[PDB]
Design a protein around this ligand. Structure first.
Ligand SMILES: CCCCCCCCCCCCCCCCCC(=O)OC[C@H](COP(=O)([O-])OCC(O)COP(=O)([O-])OC[C@@H](COC(=O)CCCCCCCCCCCCCCCCC)OC(=O)CCCCCCCCCCCCCCCCC)OC(=O)CCCCCCCCCCCCCCCCC
Ligand code: HEA
Ligand SMILES: CC(C)=CCC/C(C)=C/CC/C(C)=C/CC/C(C)=C/CC/C(C)=C/CC/C(C)=C/CC/C(C)=C/CC/C(C)=C/CC/C(C)=C/CC1=C(C)C(=O)c2ccccc2C1=O
Ligand SMILES: CC(C)=CCC/C(C)=C/CC/C(C)=C/CC/C(C)=C/CC/C(C)=C\CC/C(C)=C/CC/C(C)=C/CC/C(C)=C/CC/C(C)=C/CC1=C(C)C(=O)c2ccccc2C1=O
Ligand SMILES: CCCCCCCCCCCCCCCC(=O)O[C@H](COC(=O)CCCCCCC[C@@H](C)CCCCCCCCC)COP(=O)(O)O[C@H]1[C@H](O)[C@H](O)[C@H](O)[C@@H](O)[C@@H]1O
Ligand SMILES: CCCCCCCCCCCCCCCC(=O)O[C@H](COC(=O)CCCCCCC[C@@H](C)CCCCCCCCC)COP(=O)(O)O[C@H]1[C@H](O)[C@H](O)[C@H](O)[C@@H](O)[C@@H]1O
Ligand SMILES: CCCCCCCC/C=C\CCCCCCCC(=O)OC[C@H](COP(=O)(O)OCCN)OC(=O)CCCCCCCCCCCCCCC
Ligand code: HEC
Ligand code: HEC
Ligand SMILES: *C[C@@H](COC(=O)CCCCCCCCCCCCCCC)OC(=O)CCCCCCCC[C@@H](C)CCCCCCCC
Ligand SMILES: CCCCCCCCCCCCCCCC(=O)OC[C@H](C)OC(=O)CCCCCCCC[C@@H](C)CCCCCCCC
Ligand SMILES: *C(=O)CCCCCCCCCCCCCCC
Ligand code: FES
Lengths: 100, 54, 312, 139, 163, 223, 92, 160, 158
């Protein structure tokens, strides 16, 4: 879009790091003796309750996904703001290429 | 708590002087005694919570 | 050709299964036709190489074709509309809700195994004044006079005044075909009859699939409170014999162990089996006494051992 | 700010339509009426688009055509002082680590770790927010 | 743990049930209850004896075939009862922790694991020498009595050891 | 009771037959035999929620109970009828006795705890780590009956303290000490868990050191 | 605008001629900036040897030995890559 | 210190019964300044030697460890001046970044100290953070050789 | 992978005094001996009850329970063929309850043994259980079900 940087570049750095560490904590389910999240990726409800899959792997999965999701939300805020505000003098929003 | 702070602050001071190079030519002896001093503190701490037979 | 062009669907054993198979054949025909034309287009444009004989003359640079894009955005709407109509008509023939099922099997499916209750038998020809037990459905309403506090709270219960550990939704029957971890539960059904399945889950949501039915459902813990139509009817089962069934959800760790069987027999054979099950006899004994294998013949309750390298 | 506004009003219109049709077709033709989960989600994603589009339309009416919103705009038209764009900062990684500490204290039920992570998050967010405002030390 | 009187009472094999561990001490007939002044000091000596404490563990019968013995200690176990010193063979902390269904005598000072089924030899952690096994049997009246002293010194190792 | 046994059988046939055979004999390498475990074992194991275990791992963790008190009693009575074993203590009314299980003596209960329980749990009933993926959970949550039944039946890697090792008097004494330690406020400010050296050192290095260094940065200059 | 340039006369003492250079380490003169590569490689080999020898101990399990083997192999591979590149002149 | 002495509980000995050779606790750590000693005990792989009729217990190792540790702490400036050769009267401090090698060495030493200290707490770490005790012990065992190297490399590059 | 194929929880014997013998088609669970002893042993000639639960693993049967005798001349009073995909409970282990006052087939196959040999609790004694499918040696232990510890005489300091 002809911009020098992203809208909130400290924010996108924060998004990257929030992702990295959220993914790390989610994956850290494996080092635990019980192991990582045994419920499917979709993680349907009763199988995810403390009764079923009581191990700390499920909790780590949940919290790591929460952290990564916060990073993703911040990244989305940054990218939408960059596209709407930061743009080249001639780059009309119907002249920005399709990847943007 | 003061014993714990004594130990921790000795460690922080040692790290400060080590990383800043305050132990060089003029003040090796200081370092040395400080090291001894730290060691003593550690042992006294051990003899401190060991005093109340627990 | 159909079996090969069915992409490995087991030829159904129920009218609904057969009609679903026909829909699958038609849908695969349409999808393969679309894929073939699109692959033809892709490979034929791949014939547009940068021939060295071409000098510095860039292509037509056309882009932005209105009529062609309108045509190719209208036509897919037509294909999906026809597919949707066929889908709706076929789907209509999947939950018919016949109020007089020939047999009502209560498929209560608990963690890592199943159980079938034979809730009711009602043959149109006239027989089987049979019914399930249902004295066993007891609630857990914690409507105690008082809680921890001296007075006042008189707490009734967490959910709708009852406890989560209520299990009232589960319905129990006289002839339970429970399966153990070392014994595959074999559901005996009569051929040529309307069989309803009332689906329930004791512990955790999971799946009930009989691949030869070309249909499946999710046994949820409490479908009524989840706005789920757990029960489903099958108009007929022509083919007899044994057919595997599998848990098609996530039960838990031993989720692949949930395999069960459905052994559809003749109506007279079913009558004999139910007669010998009313009298105290295991499922295996009843099946054997009708001159049929006692154990599951499509599947086996394979090793409870955690694996091959476990030291016994 | 008109094109990116119209985008969000189009999205808002579609989401409102989808929520309304879902509510109407679930309140009847469904086992338990309105699903109350998909319906509310559709309503409040309609609200999401509505808030963003309303703000964008407000700003667009408040703003004369920008060069970026103007066809046939020369690069020299937009040339000039762009705003502050934060240079290097190590506070984002500290905020991420603080939130990770709080998250592990939540997953592993360690109330002490949750409290420590919350304190770390407040400290790191203060550092980031104050990073480019902390005046020089006065001695 | 009665307050002073009869802190030590004779023991019977039936008391320990399969998969059960109890700390036991060398109580003599002369070291009677702590009622008198002469006693209550012998008993204090028994309690404060560093190497005095032992743990008696009843190996489950189903696990009996898994037991691996130590040369010269093949008969130290009285049936399914095994007496092993509580004092860790590493730095002399008590090895109090006991895990049944895995038969792991764990020392928490430095997290050292000895296999109780096999002679109490260290299968994890700093410890390198097996816990000393106390010979045991039952005397007249069916009370559990040591069948002799440890064949080896029982505390943590030192220079003048293993000769 | 006949109806109690019927209900226990109903609940058993659809919650645990997979782990334990329909005849309560353990399925190989899935679950152990419940013959002789007793009503006390069932009560402690299911009231703590451990038994709908839902996985085979190093240590089955505690989780919300999957059955209510009446259903707990039904399962326990079913198991008691099948094999016959330890039974959960009960008071005059018939409910699981919890108040009555608090032994009067605590110093003797404290000695019993330190000699037997603290070995792996803690000085003050907190948790402790075990060999490989195992641990001893905190005793704060367990009610008097649960502590008593845990002593009376060693669940897994717990020594089983029969009624002869710890007579009902000693078991009630230990229960009293456990409850007193769990509910007793930490005299001298917020008790950092129960482990002394580790939380104490961590709190030093965080609170005291961050405060001291921040105050030094405030007083001092940078250059 | 509230700042002034600083200059420092620091007693310089080897004659900082063999080893590191300011281009590689911008503050070479200001203090110890060179650790010989020989001590690198020797220490890496010693680390790998220590990892292997810890396979000998009191542990019935073997996941632990496999992790030790993997880490020591990684260290040996890193040291070998560095040594080969240094010998050839940082090529490939 | 007064606020801590009030609001924070330190060494609640009353919860800790009088010492008996038989009674035990699972935690069993010393104050944080000896946790490095305890962790060095835990992580050192049970290596003993048996001369002619004599035993050299694994505990001996830690003593030697302390020696070396202290022998290296007390003597460090002399090793620094012998290696670097700085024998000049230094009155101006050096920013840690300006001495990448010494900063890396100090970061390595701090990393080893932290690893040992947390190894002493591997019991509690496993209890609270669900990690198998053997896994924590072996993490520390591999770390006391690997983590110092990684920390040295990272600190060197960071200083530069 | 602490929860791999070799997991601690799955491979656990029940915390019961009786041993478990899975040999043969039938499974023997909680086999033990009720034999209260007031001295070093229980003298020869005193009847001791033999408890166990026999479960038929397969539904296809080994309900015979032929002899199950060893040194001691095991006797199965009221012997019956109970096992059919179910449980054969020979006796009434301490804590065992009775659903109704009346007992079907009188005693539910109580197994008693005349020792003819001293035995003390804490030992392993081989009892060869014989079935039409096969035979199994179990080494039955001695269990004190619910009896509280007897009063040890007070000690006289010397
Ligand atoms: C659960 C419920 C809790 C909800 C709490 C969230 C409250 C935040 C909303 C406040 C308004 C706001 O953020 O305005 C931005 C506003 C404008 O930014 P700026 O730095 O002032 O402007 C200069 C540049 O924009 C600076 O340029 P730049 O490139 O840095 O842009 C970054 C800046 C500006 O960026 C933006 O404004 C973009 C929009 C994103 C900001 C909103 C996200 C922050 C909260 C997310 C957490 C999820 C919940 O945003 C931030 O400061 C990011 C905050 C980091 C939070 C990360 C958490 C992990 O920031 C502020 O001045 C104040 C922010 C203070 C936030 C307090 C958060 C603490 C909450 C913890 C309390 C504990 C209770 C729960 C337990
Ligand atoms: C982006 C998403 C994505 C991608 C790329 C893949 C890629 C692959 N997936 Fe995918 N898969 C899913 C998403 C994905 N999958 C999801 C969402 C499910 C359902 C999950 C659920 O049910 O919960 C699933 C389920 C799934 C299953 C079913 C498992 C089950 O539930 O029983 C299987 C079975 O074979 C499978 C196989 C594969 C294979 C063989 C690949 C290949 O393409 C993978 C390519 C492999 C590699 C690139 C590895 C090679 C690299 C190395 C050897 C170097 C390693 C070195 C280090 C790590 C240091 N996948
Ligand atoms: C020898 C050795 C060190 C072996 C390894 C043991 C060990 C330390 C393992 C790591 C522990 C962790 C971090 C578990 C969480 C799961 C995990 C590993 C996730 C992946 C790790 C990773 C790199 C994630 C990316 C982002 C990141 C860095 C996350 C770290 C998360 C954490 C825990 C940050 C804070 C660090 C921290 C405070 C750790 C605990 C340290 C100690 C000893 C605390 C002691 C302590 C205790 C134990 C109390 O109970 C307590 C109760 C009440 C008040 C106070 C305390 C208290 O201070
Ligand atoms: C230590 C050093 C700079 C050595 C230089 C090179 C040298 C002389 C090498 C030879 C000596 C050898 C053989 C060293 C290897 C191992 C070693 C250091 C042994 C000696 C151990 C000893 C007597 C002293 C080391 C202590 C030390 C200097 C620690 C670092 C101090 C600093 C600057 C810490 C950061 C400042 C700060 C804000 C700290 C608070 C924030 C936190 C939580 C930091 C991490 C942290 C710490 C630091 C704890 O001590 C701790 C204790 C108990 C529970 C938890 C924690 C914890 O989380
Ligand atoms: C300058 C110093 C300022 C210090 C602040 C002082 C705060 C004073 C608090 C109020 C007065 C003293 C309370 C004493 C009563 C008391 O002790 O407080 C417990 C709480 O304890 C917890 O749980 C933790 C709860 C989380 C909130 C407190 C966290 C404060 C931390 C963050 C401050 C220290 C710094 C640590 C930082 C570490 C981070 C490292 C990055 C509360 O009961 P409870 O919750 O039920 O404890 C369970 C028994 O019940 C049950 O049996 C038992 O078995 C257990 O389960 C027990 O937890
Ligand atoms: C500051 C500290 C930084 C850490 C420094 C050290 C970094 C080096 C890491 C070295 C990793 C080595 C992992 C190997 C470990 C190992 O060898 O043990 C295994 C268990 O593998 C595992 O978990 C893998 C664990 C890998 C995780 C390492 C992750 C790094 C973390 C710790 C970093 C975060 C640091 C945050 C610090 C906070 C700030 C500090 C100020 C098996 O044990 P076990 O459990 O008994 O399994 C039995 C079988 O044996 C048996 O066959 C089978 O039959 C079964 O029975 C089974 O039970
Ligand atoms: C990437 C490909 C890596 C390889 C991927 C394969 C993964 C498969 C691993 C486990 C599957 C579950 C089985 C779990 C059961 C354990 C296996 C077993 O059954 O073997 C018996 C003994 C104890 O049995 P024992 O009778 O008491 O003692 C015996 C008496 N002498 O375990 C053992 O040997 C343990 C051997 C297990 C294999 C080692 C896995 C660790 C590899 C880590 C590599 C990372 C490298 C790091 C790089 C920096
Ligand atoms: C999955 C496998 C299950 C299921 C669904 C149930 N149990 Fe059982 N059980 C299982 C294991 C791996 C163990 C040993 C380790 C542990 O308990 O976590 C047990 C043990 C028991 C015990 C303890 C016996 C004793 O201590 O002597 C009891 C009383 C018990 N199990 C009963 C029980 C009940 C009542 C269940 C349904 C509510 C049940 N289990 C389910 C494995 C599994
Ligand atoms: C390490 C050996 C060991 C000793 C000795 C021991 N425990 Fe335990 N304890 C454990 C383990 C392991 C568990 C986990 C039980 C489970 O997973 O089912 C446990 C669980 C418990 C529980 C259950 C609490 C809960 O919330 O689930 C209580 C209560 C308890 N122990 C109290 C005691 C008492 C009282 C004693 C002294 C008679 C004692 N323990 C001795 C290891 C031990
Ligand atoms: C059961 C056996 C078998 O395990 C396997 O087969 C897979 C083994 C994978 C190799 C694991 C290597 C560990 C690398 C450590 C990362 C460097 C740390 C140094 C810096 C602190 O093994 C087991 O017992 C369980 C194996 C489970 C493996 C899970 C690994 C999960 C790692 C997770 C905790 C996050 C690590 C942080 C990495 C950060 C990288 C970017 C900075
Ligand atoms: C703390 C200080 C540690 C000092 C140890 C002094 C050892 C002297 C006695 C050794 C001995 O003969 O006992 C028999 C031995 C048990 O068996 C063997 O002979 C095979 C040994 C194979 C491995 C040898 C590795 C030795 C390395 C050490 C020399 C390094 C020490 C530094
Ligand atoms: C232990 O109880 C859990 C065993 C889990 C088995 C599956 C192993 C998958 C490993 C994935 C890789 C982890 C991250 C690697 C980073 C270097
Ligand atoms: S004190 Fe027992 S292992 Fe060291």
């Amino acid at each position: 879009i002809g911009a020098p940087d992203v809208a909130f570049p400290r924010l996108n750095a924060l998004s990257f790091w929030l992702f990295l560490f959220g993914a790390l904590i989610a994956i850290a389910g494996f080092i635990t003796p019980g192991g990582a999240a045994d419920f499917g990726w979709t993680a349907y409800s009763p199988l995810t309750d403390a009764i079923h899959s009581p191990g700390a792997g499920g909790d780590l999965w949940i919290m790591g996904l929460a952290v990564g999701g916060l990073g993703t939300i911040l990244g989305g805020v940054n990218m939408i703001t960059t596209v709407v505000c930061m743009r080249a003098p001639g780059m009309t929003m119907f002249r920005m290429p399709i990847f943007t | 708590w003061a014993a714990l702070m004594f130990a921790a602050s000795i460690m922080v001071h040692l790290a400060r002087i080590f990383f800043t190079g305050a132990f060089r030519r003029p003040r090796e002896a200081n370092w040395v005694i400080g090291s001894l001093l730290l060691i003593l503190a550690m042992f006294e701490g051990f003899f401190g919570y060991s005093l109340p037979d627990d | 050709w159909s079996d090969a062009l069915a992409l490995g669907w087991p030829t159904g054993i129920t009218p609904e299964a057969k009609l679903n198979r026909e829909l699958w054949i038609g849908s695969v025909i349409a999808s393969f036709a679309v894929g073939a034309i699109v692959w033809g287009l892709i490979f034929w444009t791949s014939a547009f190489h940068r021939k060295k004989a071409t000098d510095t003359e860039l292509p037509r640079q056309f882009g932005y074709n209105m009529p062609l894009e309108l045509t190719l955005t209208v036509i897919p709407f037509l294909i999906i509309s026809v597919l949707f109509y066929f889908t709706v008509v076929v789907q209509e023939r999947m939950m018919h809700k016949d109020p007089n099922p020939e047999v009502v099997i209560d498929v209560t499916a608990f963690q890592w195994n199943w159980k079938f209750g034979y809730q009711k038998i009602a043959f149109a020809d006239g027989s089987f004044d049979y019914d399930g037990a249902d004295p066993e459905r007891k609630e857990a309403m914690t409507s105690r006079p008082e809680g921890k506090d001296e007075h006042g709270i008189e707490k009734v219960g967490p959910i709708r005044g009852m406890t989560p550990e209520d299990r009232t939704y589960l319905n129990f029957d006289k002839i339970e075909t429970l399966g153990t971890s070392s014994e595959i539960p074999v559901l005996v059904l009569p051929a040529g009859k309307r069989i309803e399945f009332v689906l329930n889950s004791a512990d955790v949501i999971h799946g009930f699939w009989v691949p030869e039915f070309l249909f499946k459902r999710d046994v949820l813990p409490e479908p009524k409170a989840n706005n789920s139509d757990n029960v489903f009817q099958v108009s007929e089962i022509q083919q007899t014999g044994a057919f595997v069934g599998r848990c098609t959800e996530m039960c838990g760790t031993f989720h692949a162990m949930m395999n069960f069987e459905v052994r559809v027999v003749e109506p007279n054979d079913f009558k004999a089996y139910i007669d010998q099950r009313n009298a105290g006899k295991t499922n295996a004994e009843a099946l054997a006494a009708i001159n049929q294998p006692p154990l599951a013949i499509t599947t086996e309750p394979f090793e409870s051992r955690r694996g091959e390298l476990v030291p016994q | 700010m008109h094109i990116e506004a119209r985008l969000f009003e189009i999205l808002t219109a579609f989401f409102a339509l989808a929520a309304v049709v879902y509510a109407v077709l679930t309140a009847m033709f469904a086992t338990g009426g309105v699903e109350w989960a998909g319906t509310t989600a559709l309503v409040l994603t309609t609200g999401l688009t509505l808030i963003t589009g309303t703000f964008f339309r407000f700003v667009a009416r408040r703003l004369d055509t920008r060069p970026e919103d103007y066809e046939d705009a020369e690069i020299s038209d937009g040339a000039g002082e762009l705003g502050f764009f934060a240079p290097h900062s190590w506070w984002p990684i500290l905020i991420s680590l603080s939130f990770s500490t709080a998250a592990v204290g939540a997953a592993l039920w360690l109330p002490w770790l949750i409290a420590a992570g919350v304190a770390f998050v407040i400290t790191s967010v203060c550092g980031l927010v104050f990073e480019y405002y902390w005046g020089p030390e006065k001695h | 743990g009665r307050p002073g009187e009869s802190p030590f009472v004779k023991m019977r094999p039936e008391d320990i049930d399969a998969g059960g561990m109890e700390t036991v001490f060398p109580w003599r007939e002369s070291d009677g209850d702590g009622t008198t002044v002469e006693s209550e000091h012998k008993l204090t000596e028994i309690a404060m004896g560093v190497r005095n404490p032992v743990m008696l563990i009843r190996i489950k019968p189903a696990d009996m075939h898994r037991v691996i013995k130590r040369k010269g200690q093949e008969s130290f176990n009285f049936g399914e009862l095994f007496a092993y010193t509580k004092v860790c063979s590493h730095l002399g902390c008590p090895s109090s922790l006991y895990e049944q269904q895995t038969y792991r005598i764990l020392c928490p000072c430095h997290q050292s694991q000895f296999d109780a089924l096999e002679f109490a030899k260290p299968i994890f952690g700093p410890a390198a020498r097996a816990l000393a096994q106390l010979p045991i049997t039952i005397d007249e009246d069916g009370y559990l009595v040591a069948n002799g002293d440890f064949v080896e010194p029982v505390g943590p190792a030192f220079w003048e050891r293993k000769s | 009771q006949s109806a109690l046994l019927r209900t226990g059988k109903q609940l058993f046939e659809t919650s645990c037959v997979s782990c334990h055979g329909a005849n309560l004999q353990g399925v190989p390498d899935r679950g152990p035999s419940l013959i002789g475990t007793g009503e006390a074992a069932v009560y402690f194991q299911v009231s703590t929620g451990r038994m709908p275990a839902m996985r085979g791992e190093a240590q089955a963790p505690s989780k919300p109970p999957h059955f209510d008190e009446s259903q707990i009693d039904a399962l326990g009575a079913y198991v008691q009828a099948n094999g016959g074993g330890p039974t959960v203590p009960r008071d005059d009314h018939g409910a699981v006795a919890q108040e009555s299980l608090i032994g009067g003596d605590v110093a003797r209960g404290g000695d019993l705890f330190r000699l037997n329980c603290a070995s792996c749990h803690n000085f003050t009933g907190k948790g402790g780590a075990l060999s490989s993926g195992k641990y001893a959970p905190d005793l704060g949550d367990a009610n008097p009956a649960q502590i008593y039944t845990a002593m009376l039946t060693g669940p897994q890697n717990m020594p089983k303290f029969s009624d002869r090792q710890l007579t009902p008097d000693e078991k009630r004494d230990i229960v009293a000490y456990v409850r007193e330690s769990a509910e007793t406020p930490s005299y001298g400010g917020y008790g950092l868990g129960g482990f002394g050296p580790a939380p104490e050192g961590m709190a030093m290095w965080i609170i005291g050191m961050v405060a001291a260094i921040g105050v030094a940065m405030w007083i001092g200059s940078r250059a | 605008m509230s700042s002034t340039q600083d200059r420092s006369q620091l007693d310089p003492e080897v004659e900082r001629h063999t080893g590191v250079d300011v281009e590689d380490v911008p503050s070479a003169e200001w203090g110890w900036s060179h650790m010989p590569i020989g001590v690198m490689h020797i220490g890496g080999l010693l680390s790998a040897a220590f990892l292997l020898v810890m396979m000998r101990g009191n542990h019935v399990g073997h996941v632990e030995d496999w992790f030790l083997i993997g880490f020591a192999a990684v260290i040996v591979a890193l040291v070998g890559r560095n040594w080969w590149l240094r010998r050839r002149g940082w090529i490939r | 210190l007064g606020l801590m002495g009030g609001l924070l509980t330190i060494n609640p000995i009353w919860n800790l019964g009088p010492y008996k050779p038989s009674q035990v606790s699972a935690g069993s750590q010393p104050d944080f300044y000896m946790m490095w000693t305890d962790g060095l005990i835990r992580l050192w792989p049970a290596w003993e030697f048996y001369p002619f009729g004599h035993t050299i217990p694994q505990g001996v190792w830690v003593a030697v460890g302390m020696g070396l540790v202290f022998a290296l702490l007390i003597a460090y400036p002399f090793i620094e001046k012998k290696v670097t050769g700085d024998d000049a009267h230094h009155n101006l401090l050096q920013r840690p970044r300006d001495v990448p090698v010494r900063t890396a060495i100090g970061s390595m030493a701090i990393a080893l100290y932290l690893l040992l200290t947390f190894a002493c707490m591997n019991d509690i770490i496993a209890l609270k953070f669900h990690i198998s005790l053997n896994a924590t012990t072996w993490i520390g065992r591999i770390g006391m050789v690997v983590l110092p190297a990684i920390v040295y490399f990272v600190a060197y590059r960071w200083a530069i | 992978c602490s929860a791999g194929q070799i997991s601690q929880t799955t491979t656990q014997e029940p915390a019961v005094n009786g041993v478990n013998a899975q040999a043969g088609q039938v499974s023997l669970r909680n086999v033990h001996l009720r034999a209260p002893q007031q001295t070093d042993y229980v003298e020869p000639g005193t009847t001791v009850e033999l408890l166990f639960v026999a479960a038929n693993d397969s539904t296809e049967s080994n309900k015979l329970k032929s002899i199950t005798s060893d040194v001691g001349e095991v006797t199965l009073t009221g012997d019956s063929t109970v096992p059919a995909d179910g449980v054969l409970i020979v006796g009434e282990p301490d804590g065992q309850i009775q659903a109704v006052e009346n007992a079907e087939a009188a005693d539910a196959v109580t197994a008693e043994v005349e020792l003819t040999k001293p035995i003390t609790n804490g030992l392993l004694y081989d009892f060869t259980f014989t079935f039409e499918d096969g035979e199994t040696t179990v080494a039955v232990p001695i269990s004190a079900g619910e009896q509280p510890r007897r009063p040890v005489p007070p000690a006289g300091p010397g």
